[PDB]
Structures are given as C-alpha cells and as structure tokens.
C-alpha cells in the first residue's frame, strides 16, 4: 500500500479524481509517481533509452556515476521522459522510471487531411529545442508511419503518434538532448492554439476546491 504525502495524492487515492486529464487541466504538479500508476494502469510501457557513464575527476582518480534516460508512456496519448544519475545502474534506472512517470505529458493527436476516424498524427508542425538540438514534427498522411531517427521514433511511438514526418538539426548524437527536444516538441502539441480551441473556456471547479469538504474532513 501507498500512503499519500500530498493533497493531490490524497484526493487521487480516495477515488475522487476521475482522470489524469483533470490534473492536466489545472496544471497541478505530480509529486508522487503513484498517481500516474493509479491513473494509467499497466498500459504504461517503459524503455531505457540510454545508460551513459559520467565521470568526475578526483584526486585519487575518477568517480563514475551512471545516468539513465528512460522513456515511458501508454501508446494512446501520454508520454514521459526521465533522466536520473546514480552510483549504480539499477538505482539510476529505477529513479529514471520514477521521474519519467512524474513527467507524463498529454499528447494532442490530429489529422493530416480528411478527419476520418481516430486522430493519427500531430495537429500541426511543432518544434522542440534542447541545447542546440531542434526537432520538428510535421503531420503526415495516414499509414506513413514515423519518419524519424530511432530515438524520436521510440518517443513518438510511445506517445501514440501513428504517423509523423520529422526534421532534426544540431548535435543529435547527444541522445539526451535529442530525446529532450523530441519530448519538448511532443509536449508543445497541447499548447498550440488552433482555431478549434477559440471557444471561450468554461471553468470547472478545481479539485483542491471541488472536494474541500473531503480534505477538511480527513
């Protein structure tokens, strides 16, 4: 069993947050990885993108730690990427999985041409950046697949993007920056104001206020 240490975690625990989309709606940070577990079940698959050893020079020699880059996400609209450095590889991987869970972001899927069936591609051209690495995602016709490098391909498949064109620029050989720029581009999908989102936002009551009686009662 898991005992929440946060108000949001406590609300999620006692079955009164219906979906992760509510937390995403009110921009509330996720501080416990158990919330993501509860909401997304075992549909969350994770893949260790990289294990890289980083060495710090010392008087006696070099102190080597290991940084794990782990991508996670159900292939239906949620993706996250975590990076954790530790003394041993197993702890680094476990922490990177935790941080990838804590960073799950909603992915907006759209259409290329005719809006037939489920959305398959990115809604529009979106660009992410990370330290000289620029990654641009472009809508592609149905059945195209992901036209990208292997690392963005993994990140985009985990996000649920069925097909997408991709352009990259910079030192993409730094897998960390490539992955983080792809993650930035993917997370930029729901921040783009398209004409279908011009409808004035009708506010709903926040969880910290919707169940304030529950929060004060226990």
């Amino acid at each position: 069993e898991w005992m929440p240490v946060t108000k949001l975690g406590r609300l999620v625990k006692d079955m009164k947050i219906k979906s992760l989309e509510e937390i995403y709606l009110f921009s509330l940070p996720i501080k416990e990885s158990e919330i993501i577990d509860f909401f997304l079940g075992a549909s969350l698959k994770d893949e260790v993108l990289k294990i890289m050893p980083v060495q710090k020079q010392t008087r006696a020699g070099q102190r080597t730690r290991f940084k794990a880059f782990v991508a996670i996400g159900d292939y239906n609209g949620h993706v996250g990427l975590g990076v954790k450095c530790s003394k041993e590889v197993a702890t680094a991987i476990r922490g990177a999985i935790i941080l990838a869970k804590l960073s799950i972001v909603p992915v907006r899927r759209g259409y290329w041409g005719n809006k037939i069936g489920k959305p398959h591609t990115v809604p529009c051209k979106v660009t992410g950046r990370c330290g000289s690495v620029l990654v641009r995602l472009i809508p592609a016709p149905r059945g195209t697949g992901i036209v990208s490098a292997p690392v963005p391909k993994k990140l985009l498949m985990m996000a649920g993007i069925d097909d997408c064109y991709t352009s990259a620029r910079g030192c993409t050989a730094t897998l960390g920056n490539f992955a983080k720029a792809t993650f930035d581009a993917i997370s930029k999908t729901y921040s783009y104001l398209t004409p279908d989102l011009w409808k004035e936002t009708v506010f709903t009551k926040s969880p910290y206020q919707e169940f304030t009686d529950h929060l004060v009662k226990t």
Binding site: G113, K115, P123, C124, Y192
Partner: protein, 129 residues
Amino acid sequence: VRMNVLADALKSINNAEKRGKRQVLIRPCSKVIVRFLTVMMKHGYIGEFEIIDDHRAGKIVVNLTGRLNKCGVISPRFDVQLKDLEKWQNNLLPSRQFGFIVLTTSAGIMDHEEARRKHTGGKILGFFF
C-alpha cells in the same frame, strides 16, 4: 530605409501579439495594409481596427484577440500560379486544417482558399496562422 510597409505592419502585429498586448499601433497605413487586415479579420484572427487619419499617412490601432500565432510577409512578392499554390502552403502553413496564405490577384487581395475558388493565381503577400 523603410521599404515594404506591410512587413513593418505585420512585424508590429506579431511582436505585440507575442507580448500579450490588446492593441497595436501600426504606422504608416496603406491600402495593402488595410486589405491584409480585413482578410485577417474576416477569419477572426485580428478583430476590430480603426484608421487614424492624419493628413500625411494614416495610422491604424488594431485591437488584438490572442488567436494569432504568427503573421508574416513574404518578400519579394513572388508571382505564384495556381498549380504552384499548394507547394507554398506546404512551406508556410502549420497544417492543412488552419492557416492562410494571402495573395494579391487581379480580382483583389484574398486568402489562398478564395484564390482557388475564384481560379486565379497572383503574388504572395504574406501568411497568418
């Protein structure tokens, strides 16, 4: 010096939109500027605007609704044909679901969709999305 006042107008609108302001002062005003603003307004991107008349060259105060991602000019004004129009909207527009390319044609200034409907190419002025 100052050339292609439409570039200055569109850059001013873009900068004021990025800063989150509600109004932008465009100067000088021009017929092409007013037509471009009308095309942008008919699609809901820009909202109302008023032309201040000074006796030399007017200014425009443009109210800003925060629906505009980017308004830009294409310089030089390449003479685009209808058969070559699609390539242009591949280079400038975010998706095929929204965004417009503004052309000036023998039938007036209008977006790419209206140019295709009227069956007339022209010269590309700019784009907005």
